[PDB]
Design a protein around this ligand. Structure first.
Ligand code: ZN
Lengths: 23, 181, 69, 83, 114
RNA sequence: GCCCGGAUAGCUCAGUCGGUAGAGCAGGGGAUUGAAAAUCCCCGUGUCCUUGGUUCGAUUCCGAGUCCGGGCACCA
RNA sequence: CGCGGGGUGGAGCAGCCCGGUAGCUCGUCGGGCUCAUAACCCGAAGGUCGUCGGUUCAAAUCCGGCCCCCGCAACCA
RNA sequence: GGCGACACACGUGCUACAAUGCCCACUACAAAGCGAUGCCACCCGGCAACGGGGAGCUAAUCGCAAAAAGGUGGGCCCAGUUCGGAUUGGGGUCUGCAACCCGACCCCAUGAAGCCGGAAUCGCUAGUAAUCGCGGAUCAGCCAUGCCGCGGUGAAUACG
RNA sequence: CGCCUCCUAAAAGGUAACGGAGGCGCCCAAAGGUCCCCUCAGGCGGGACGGAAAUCCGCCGGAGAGCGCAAGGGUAGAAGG
């Protein structure tokens, strides 16, 4: 869910980028 | 009787080996495998699931021999078990089924043991008799995870003609029992 | 042996996860296994199979000793 | 953790003291205000009264505490439960 | 089946692999690749050569079920031995990573004791 | 010992002169209420004690038995 | 000391006959309502069931001894 | 060092407990602000964080910056789940002099409770609720789910 | 207040006391008959759950177990299973 760093959505809600939220 | 290649190993290797290491002055002095006792202290069908013939089914599949029932030697209060009450299966694996079951045991069951660091090098009766325990019965190739419904381990009593734990663990060692330590 | 109680064994075809065949006598003719002695770690030097480091601690001092002194 | 690109931070004066006693052998139990440094493998075998905020708590340095900060082994808070 | 446990046949291998303790989506997403295995195939939909390929591979890639749990408890065991603050938290069974100990530590403290 | 009474929903009891096992009490839920409530709506659940026989079917009718309750006596 | 009875969670009591599981009310704690308190509601926790021995697989629950309490009696002079 | 404790208790929030959903990929659509030691385009390396380069921007023109939900297709098929992400082990990036108490972020693994919540109780009458995302203040960093705003979709109901 | 066991009770029996102890007012259709087969308690050691004690195994055990119920007697060369 929105609290999952591994989820893209989580980084979205986290407002960051990682392996699962490219830029 | 039929052939069992592991017993063959015993005669071909283990016998001359122990003759070497120990120099038994008569061949009846070398250790031998009396029998393999299979116990399962179920303690479940004592009151409920009274037909745990699935248990004897699994044991028969594992040994080709339907085991014996061990009943309540006397009632107990702390343990919900009155006397005259099935609490455990047991079978006396002998020559053919003995060496067979052992072959399957070393060759399959131990390698299928979870985190199998070996066998206890100290689980010895003292009389040249080794024992151990299991936390499940699905370890064996006959038993599939589908057919298995509940993990019931056991304790296995390997009996040996030898008298000392030194000569005993010598014998099993020759048989290649993977000792944990 | 009580004749008719004992489930009859047969020549047993054991197949390892390595396909290592260990023919024996079992109630089922052929049976597969995920492991054999010839593949189990405890027999093949343990191989470590993931990690041969063997207590990485303590060091393993990589990124260490770069102190200015 | 501190960026390995950056060096392993260690309070030099405390680090230097350790390297000093190294030449002078294990001795001179070091009181330190320097909780923030990381233990260095030289530090093993030494001992330090690490400052806890009010006190310098003696800590013997083993290899099991090399890759850690000094202050970690000096608990700055004293808890004992309730009642 | 595989290293410690069995994968659910009616489920695709993707989640099946992750069911292995010590394997998340990442290694699940990868071992199929290094073993070239199609993830869409259900666990029941798996051929032997695929599985033995994947089995031996993944079992030789990372310690998953038992060996992993060894170091895990080991890492916390070795922590408790040195007496680090982190080890203190474990030996106290309290939130180790700087959590607000006062409230919202039920995940580390379980039931409430009023 | 004799007489007779019932064995039914978790309970109470309906119960065909053989076509169906039901009323309410309890239970739960819904609405209901500030609480208490009551109410209300709806679901709750039975070899119709057992055996039999009859008749197309028997909860019914019936033969037996048991329990079951009472009474009516008698006690060497 | 003669006879009868009793001594269960903090309080009062129940389960004893029939040894397999001890429940109710009050009360405690937490919360709720209130400006606060009481009341009320939600929720939870909470018992060698006198002592000690034997019976029993097992004893509050059976048996005995002891302690305490209660009751009745302790007379014919 | 403490203000970060922590058997506990309350308030206020966020995330959820799933299919009107979740995940993946592509494709859209804003507003409002911010920015010279700051936005940093773009490029490379790196799983990523990010790092090495590096133009423009000195501000309608450079950038932050992608809006997100939405739409297309795919997967999942009711599962404590491809729900849930809590906790924890480990490996890293950045800031900082220094991230042990006491930062954030990335990656791997771990995968907690939780099946819509008693008593009770809150807000809202329209672009409102509800839901989705975006900017700024403080600030090196951020413990911001807060706060102040900005916009997307967008309701039901009012007898009295 | 009747019966059973023990001591009282003095090495036959019996033997009193408001003497010291306890039991019984049944139960088993098998707990009976016979044939065959087995031997316990207990302790150690080893043994998944699993304990102190479940079931297992090996080791030592003359009866100290059991034998429906009080005690006693009897008893495994069985009355025990
Ligand atoms: Zn193999």
């Amino acid at each position: 869910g929105k609290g999952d760093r591994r989820t893209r959505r989580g980084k979205i809600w986290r407002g960051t980028y990682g392996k699962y939220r490219p830029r | 009787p039929l052939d069992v290649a592991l017993k063959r190993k015993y005669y071909e290797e283990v016998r001359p080996e122990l003759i070497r290491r120990f120099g038994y002055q008569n061949v009846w002095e070398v250790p031998r495998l009396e029998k393999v006792v299979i116990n399962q202290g179920l303690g479940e069908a004592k009151e409920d699931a009274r037909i745990l013939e699935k248990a004897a089914q699994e044991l028969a599949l594992i040994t080709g021999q339907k085991p014996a029932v061990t009943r309540a030697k006397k009632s107990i209060s702390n343990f919900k078990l009155r006397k005259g009450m099935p609490i455990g299966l047991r079978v006396t694996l002998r020559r053919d089924r003995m060496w067979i079951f052992l072959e399957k045991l070393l060759n399959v069951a131990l390698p299928r043991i979870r985190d199998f660091r070996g066998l206890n090098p100290n689980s010895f009766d003292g009389r040249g008799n080794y024992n151990l325990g299991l936390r499940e019965q699905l370890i064996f190739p006959e038993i599939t995870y589908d057919m298995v419904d509940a993990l019931r381990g056991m304790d296995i009593a390997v009996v040996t003609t030898a008298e000392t734990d030194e000569e005993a663990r010598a014998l099993l060692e020759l048989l290649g029992f993977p000792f944990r330590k | 042996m009580k004749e008719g109680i004992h489930p009859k064994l047969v020549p047993a075809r054991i197949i390892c996860g390595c396909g290592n065949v260990i023919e024996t006598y079992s109630t089922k003719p052929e049976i597969y296994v995920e492991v054999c002695s010839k593949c189990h770690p405890f027999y093949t030097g343990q191989q470590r199979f993931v990690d041969t480091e063997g207590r990485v601690e303590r060091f393993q001092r990589r990124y260490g000793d770069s102190y200015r002194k | 953790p501190r960026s390995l690109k950056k060096g392993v931070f260690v309070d030099d004066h405390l680090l230097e003291k350790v390297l000093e006693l190294n030449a002078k052998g294990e001795k001179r139990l070091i009181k330190t205000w320097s909780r923030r440094s990381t233990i260095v493998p030289e530090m093993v075998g030494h001992t330090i009264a690490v400052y806890n905020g009010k006190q310098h708590v003696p800590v013997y340095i083993t290899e099991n505490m090399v890759g850690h900060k000094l202050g970690e082994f000096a608990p700055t808070r004293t808890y004992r439960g309730h009642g | 089946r595989i290293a410690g446990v069995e994968i659910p046949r009616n489920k695709r291998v993707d989640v099946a692999l992750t069911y292995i303790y010590g394997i998340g989506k990442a290694r699940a997403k990868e071992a199929l690749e290094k073993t070239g295995i199609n993830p869409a195939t259900r666990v029941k939909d798996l051929t032997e050569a695929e599985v033995v390929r994947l089995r031996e591979y993944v079992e030789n890639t990372w310690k998953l079920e038992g060996e992993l749990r060894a170091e895990v408890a080991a890492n916390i065991k070795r922590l408790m031995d040195i007496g680090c603050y982190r080890g203190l938290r474990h030996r106290r069974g309290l939130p180790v990573r700087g959590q607000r100990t006062r409230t919202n530590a039920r995940t580390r403290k379980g039931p409430r004791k009023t």
